[PDB]
Amino acid sequence: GSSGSSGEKTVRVVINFKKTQKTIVRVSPHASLQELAPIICSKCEFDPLHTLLLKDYQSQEPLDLTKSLNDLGLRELYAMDVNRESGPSSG
């Protein structure tokens, strides 16, 4: 991990949630959603334990954590609340 030295060079992203409410936060577009999962969910006091990252409120396609706002090329995203945690992990 990493505490986080300095918190500058951040972009304004839109966090759509509840398919009704939305909020804006300033975070690094570089960091992968995987790392901005909590930074975001937290901002929306959401549970990153069972949270998904869809394109936008409209679209329902899942995004790639590994990919960042840059890699993705989006300024806004939606946080979906599902329930699924099971599978192997190693490489």
How many residues are listed for the chain in this entry?
Answer: 91
Question: How far apart, in whole angstroms, are the C-alpha atoms of residue 20 and residue 60?
Answer: 15
Identify the CA nearest to 23 among candidates 80, 82, 81, 78: 78
Q: Which residues contact 57 (CB under 8 A, 6 or more apart)?
A: 16, 19, 78
Q: How far is CA 52 from CA 1, 34, 58, 83, in A?
A: 22, 11, 14, 9
Range of the domain at 59: 1-91
Number of domains in the chain: 1
Which strands form 21-27's sheet, in the order they lie side by side?
21-27, 11-17, 76-81, 51-54
DSSP single-letter state for residue 45: T
Report the CATH number that the domain containing residue 55 is assigned in CATH: 3.10.20.90
Identify the CA nearest to 51 among candidates 42, 59, 9: 42
Residue labelled with tokens 């990919």: 67
